[PDB]
Amino acid sequence: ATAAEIAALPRQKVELVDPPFVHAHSQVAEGGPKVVEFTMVIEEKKIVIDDAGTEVHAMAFNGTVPGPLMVVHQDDYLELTLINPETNTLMHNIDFHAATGALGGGGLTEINPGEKTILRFKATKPGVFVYHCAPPGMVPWHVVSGMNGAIMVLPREGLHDGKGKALTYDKIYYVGEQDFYVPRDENGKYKKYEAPGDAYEDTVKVMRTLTPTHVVFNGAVGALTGDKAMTAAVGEKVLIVHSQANRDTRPHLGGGHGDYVWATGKFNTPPDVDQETWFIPGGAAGAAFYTFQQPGIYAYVNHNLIEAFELGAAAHFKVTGEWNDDLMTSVLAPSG
Amino acid sequence: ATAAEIAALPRQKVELVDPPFVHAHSQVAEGGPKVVEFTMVIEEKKIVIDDAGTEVHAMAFNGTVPGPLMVVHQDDYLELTLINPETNTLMHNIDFHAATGALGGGGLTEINPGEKTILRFKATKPGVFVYHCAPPGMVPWHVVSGMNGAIMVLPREGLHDGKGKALTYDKIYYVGEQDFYVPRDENGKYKKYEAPGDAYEDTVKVMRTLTPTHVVFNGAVGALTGDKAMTAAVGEKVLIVHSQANRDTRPHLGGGHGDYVWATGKFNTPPDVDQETWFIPGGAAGAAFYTFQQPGIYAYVNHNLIEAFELGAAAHFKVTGEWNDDLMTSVLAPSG
Amino acid sequence: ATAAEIAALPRQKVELVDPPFVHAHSQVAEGGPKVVEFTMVIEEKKIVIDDAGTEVHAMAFNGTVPGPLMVVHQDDYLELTLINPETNTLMHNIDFHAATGALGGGGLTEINPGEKTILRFKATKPGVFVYHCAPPGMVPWHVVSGMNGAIMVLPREGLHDGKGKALTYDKIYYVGEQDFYVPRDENGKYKKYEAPGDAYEDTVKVMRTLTPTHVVFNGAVGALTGDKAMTAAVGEKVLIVHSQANRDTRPHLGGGHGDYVWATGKFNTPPDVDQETWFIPGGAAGAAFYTFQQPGIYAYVNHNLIEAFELGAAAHFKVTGEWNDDLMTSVLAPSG
């Protein structure tokens, strides 16, 4: 619309929350198009990714791996203030796969330590989309160092199934999956480095094998298990957004299904249904909607089970409620 | 349904057959919901997977790799009696991706050698689904030792295309694809062991490379070729169910196509059509429907040709009938 | 149709052009079914695939990697005269995934050096399809030496979206992606070989790692960049056909989207829409339609960013036109 119209749209600042949780939002849009404002500070920091104290110099949007999920509605504008503190050592930027132009905004947001930038783009396509850092010449290094996340652009009228019936979730979680490539010495021990740049050469060699040393959810092996398992109750409707900015994954809810899965992550593409295991290509986000029918622990995993159970890509859902013997029952328990 | 209502349902005992063949069943359901009974004994046994005499310590449902295809209709109940003989050395269980609750039944079917269990679940969603063993802490190991198969939950009214027209097959085959990780000694020779447990440590190291040493159909290189080639005739409609419990595959019928392909394996998701090569993610099963139009040998392969022709993922179809020159003809045969 | 009916159809000889360009054609078919004639000479030739000077003994249809795109309409007949010059040293053939019978024509086109053959087949199914050499016992070696390309079988009424609306492109490009497996010496430097056969054993060993040393577009790292970047203008509609005869890929247009993507490459399968990153399994071709909205440089990549930026799978689009600040704008340029 006109120049005045855009300038007159309401501006609204939103407080982000760390994954797997998601900031406050409404499924059906409230009011007309708005300029939704977010601010994220980039943090280069050492994080431990496994039970052996293995370290990675993470490059983290808002200080987390994955970066937080930003939620807007179709035709709203997302206006991000991106800050790169003087304490960091590298230049960073951001590419929103949801955006149109300049490498998703990457060409307009190259900021050195001590600089900030503000990017605005119109969210013209509904769906979940990956966002990731992409500095010319060092794109994969920043992405596999954890500098990626996703956003969700909801249809202004909320979600719907293939027949146009509304799909309203009770809660939503964002599972960011990260492939890491940590160098090892000749004895097989993971190496540690003083500064991010010190690990560059060694890391690229591991990257070229196309074989991650770790594949994790929310930044570490077991980050979404135990006391940090995601939760739900029988009867509750849950949307699970999943992203992988660099490598393929195949999510599976063990003991459950994806009732409606936008495998490509785009809401104008009708969702597949009754899915056992869906597929999200590297460089994309997907979303699955499920209504829980049984209480208990569910294993939510990348279904290359070696990646899930040897490399780290396994999360848990802890569900409360009444067991349904119609759906499943032990007719004869394990016995001699 | 109530326990009493379920108790009043008719029961039907099914006799399983070894892949790639499928037990007798009817495409369109005969009568109302029933409790379909199956029994499978678990057999830990050595299997030779290539012509170099390479061995794998298979953990096989019903004694085969893959385990047999079980066929029921939507809303029937599948009641499996699973037996772990005292001659085996490990605990095993079963997780049906088609089921709802307790890790697909895995949590209710953990049986030590000498024990048996009976699980019943309601087949509420139509499609082909993977089933696999998943002992806590030893999941990928059992799955990549061949302990997986699939089931098909047919719509009560049989198969239909995306427009509701019936699709009725003349023959059905089940191709289970398996990635194996066989340890090698310093001289590049595959190692042999006299106990499943003895190979654990060495196998986990190969599994972590995410690079299988073998990728085969029906448990071994050449298992579905030569004398075990699948058969059909021109004009015959064939359904090919394919599963891969741990790793991605991309089936292709050389010389033919997938006229209708439920790539996600779920019948409520309209099938793709006129497919050259489809994709099935690790942890899932898919199904392709084709009407043969030409006689001859067809190469059915995982289309990463290195996996098909160097690693073993290739099968054959031998088709009888009249050649169709309209569809294809050699105008000029190979000549100087 | 009968032999007589086919002999009565008009014939049109087409001159092929080198990828990423496509020979002249009409989107909507001109007239009734035709026998469209193509000729390709196979050339075993040395090609350099990177700036370091790495060599590959390519097996090239029409002298290029990928082989050229052949375009016909559904129900036309494709008649290919395939020539294997006496200067070559290996037997070759061709398997058209678009064809029905004899392994896509492979069983009828085995020609030794000094021979030629003419194969004709009816293009019964619409879509883009891979074609590749496949000599019994040496299949993957020929394919990963670059002996593959694609054809496009357009619907007689041109392309349409999933709801029947016509989709007419202004330009079309064919991006062939090739995984290469180049042997290295003890210093980690790529090896060169006098004759192609000399490289066989070393190459098969690399192939078995399932880890390509290079993944490139149009035969070489950076082949579609610089003066050879693809081009478009704001408002221009472009169809991008992409193929990978042996390995999966996940195309992404950086700064843009796939407005309509026939990810399976088959036109009778409704296209996905508003795609960020699509997926084409090894052994298939896919096609994406996009209307450019912003000027500037776009990175078209396989979105496993290691494969794109370390291995070579990255191309550029140079787009002329006016910047759209409504779609995207730098509110605050990088500043302190």
Ligand SMILES: O=N[O-]
């Ligand atoms: O839920 N793991 O198969």
Ligand SMILES: O=N[O-]
């Ligand atoms: O067309 N099968 O390689």
Ligand SMILES: O=N[O-]
């Ligand atoms: O377009 N590279 O993320």
Ligand SMILES: [Cu+2]
């Ligand atoms: Cu960065």
Ligand SMILES: [Cu+2]
């Ligand atoms: Cu990207």
Ligand SMILES: [Cu+2]
């Ligand atoms: Cu087991």
Ligand SMILES: [Cu+2]
């Ligand atoms: Cu599973």
Ligand SMILES: [Cu+2]
């Ligand atoms: Cu060849």
Ligand SMILES: [Cu+2]
């Ligand atoms: Cu092929």
